[PDB]
């Protein structure tokens, strides 16, 4: 239980140090470019 | 009795400690991979 | 030289600012530690709700009623660590 | 009852001082990076 | 975007929609090289 | 200004006002650099 405790706080520690710098915009540019690809996907729709 | 409680508290809890060990050790090399993936290429980058 | 100067406290600021996201690295750690607590607090407070389920199904309320002290005991603690949590989200903030 | 108490008390007494240590220690260091955003860079620009 | 005419006539607007990324990926690199190639052949006339 | 038209097409416009203040710093990076431009063109006059 203290060794599983130890890697617990380990990942709630990792999880922050994430957490509190990886919101990036970036992933809203990913966001839009999924959605890019999604028109894609619907021009070919309407070709077909 | 006491040999039978005792037989199903051992069997229970190794088996219960080995999963979590491994979905432990698994969830903690899945989010390593997010920050190597963050992080790799930076200071090629920059130096090109 | 004021421009060797101003530089150099600018290099001196990379530090600085280098600390600052460690100090928001830890705080962000304090606060998904603090909500890990309660919400196993919280779990465990339904298994002893459970427990006295099955203590009030076999008849025993002085059963039932320890456990839901048990109960009781999580739930209070786990609105300590959602007051400290507060306190963790504004530092958090502040410091972003 | 002496002992049922006694014990009640220390774990209460000891959870409630390491929750509050804690959360002064994230406090004062919250407290101390608005002191040190507020100071920074401030003899650099009046070099420059 | 023969491979993507296969797909929509077998219905994989998926495989569609993926192909034609590559269709993308492949005529902005040619837009590039054609940009790189406008710089060759007013280089070209200069050194002539 | 084109990150901003993609936020503003899927709604998002949170994304589009942070995506204009980078077009403001900018276009009045870009005008500070044209009011040095005016400085290096009297003087590059001058010394012809």
């Given at each position: 239980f203290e060794r599983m405790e130890n890697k617990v706080l380990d990942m709630e520690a990792?999880?922050?140090?994430?957490?509190?710098?990886?919101?990036?915009?970036?992933?809203?540019?990913?966001?839009?470019?999924?959605?890019s690809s999604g028109v894609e996907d619907e021009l070919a729709a309407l070709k077909a | 009795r006491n040999l039978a409680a005792l037989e199903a508290k051992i069997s229970e809890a190794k088996t219960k400690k080995n999963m979590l060990q491994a979905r432990a050790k698994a969830a903690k090399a899945n989010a390593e991979l997010?920050?190597?993936?963050?992080?790799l290429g930076t200071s090629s980058a920059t130096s090109a | 030289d004021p421009e060797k100067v101003l530089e150099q406290a600018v290099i001196d600021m990379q530090e600085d600012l280098v600390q600052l996201r460690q100090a928001v690295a830890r705080t962000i750690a304090e606060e998904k530690r603090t909500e890990q607590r309660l919400n196993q607090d919280t779990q465990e407070a339904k298994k002893w709700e459970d427990r006295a389920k099955l203590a009030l199904t076999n008849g025993e309320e002085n059963l039932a009623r320890e456990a839901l002290a048990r109960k009781k005991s999580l739930t209070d603690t786990a609105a300590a660590y959602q007051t400290q949590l507060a306190q963790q989200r504004t530092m958090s903030e502040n410091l972003r």
């Open positions: 990792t999880s922050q140090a994430a957490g509190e710098l990886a919101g990036f915009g970036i992933e809203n540019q990913f966001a839009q470019l999924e959605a | 997010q920050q190597t993936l963050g992080g | -």
